[PDB]
Structures are given as C-alpha cells and as structure tokens.
Design a protein around this nucleic acid. Structure first.
Ligand SMILES: [Zn+2]
Ligand SMILES: [Zn+2]
Length: 95
DNA sequence: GTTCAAGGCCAG
DNA sequence: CTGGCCTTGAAC
C-alpha cells in the first residue's frame, strides 16, 4: 500500500496506521524532541516521496492530519512490548 | 517461541 | 536531518 503522507512504500503500522519507514522515523524524531518547524510557503505544501524532505512543517501537519498518534510515541522511551493500539491494528488488518 | 510495533543506530 | 536497518519485549 501507499503511505497516506508521502505515497512511499508502507512498511507496517506506525503510530496508528500504515506508513512508510521514513515517515515513521520522521514522526518519532519530531515528537520525541518536541521539534517545531516553520513553513516558508503557505502551510499547505504538497507532500510526496521526492518533496517530503523539503518542508518538515507541512510533512508533520500531514502526519497529524492523516491520523498519526502522538500517544503512540513513548514518553519513557520504553522498548518493545505492545501499546494500547495493539488490538486496533489486529482489527484493521482483518477488515 | 513468535509477533511486530516501538525505540536506537549511524552512514550519508 | 534523513531514512534503512537493527534491537527490544509485552502480548499472544
Ligand atoms: Zn511516508
Ligand atoms: Zn509547508
């Protein structure tokens, strides 16, 4: 399937839904360090595989827009296991 | 024992 | 900063 954010190849469920590996890394990086970006355009830049790197601000807005969850990023940076969205993913897979 | 989604590593 | 690959571990 295609990443709902940039269209790249999905690698699995990441923070609420299927996304590509790069967007998973980007969202993690962003939320973990409270990164704050600023768009030089009009905060409505188009995101695609070849432009996602051009504006992190709009890339992040899209991540939130499509449904990526801030709560899936762990405050205590705990490793492994499975979060509260475990069952949800199991349901999304079936349907 | 196996899954597999979340965190970590690091070459570029 | 980016993103492909690695490590971790509760849930099943
Ligand atoms: Zn993506
Ligand atoms: Zn923008």
């Amino acid at each position: 399937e295609l990443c709902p954010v940039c269209g790249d190849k999905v690698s699995g469920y990441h923070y609420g839904l299927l996304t590509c590996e790069s967007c998973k890394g980007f969202f993690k990086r962003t939320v973990q360090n409270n990164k704050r970006y600023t768009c030089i355009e009009n905060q409505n830049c188009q995101i695609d595989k070849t432009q996602r790197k051009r504006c992190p601000y709009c890339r992040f807005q899209k991540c939130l827009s499509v449904g990526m969850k801030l709560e899936a990023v762990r405050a205590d940076r705990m490793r492994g296991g499975r979060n509260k969205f475990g069952p949800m993913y199991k349901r999304d897979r079936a349907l």
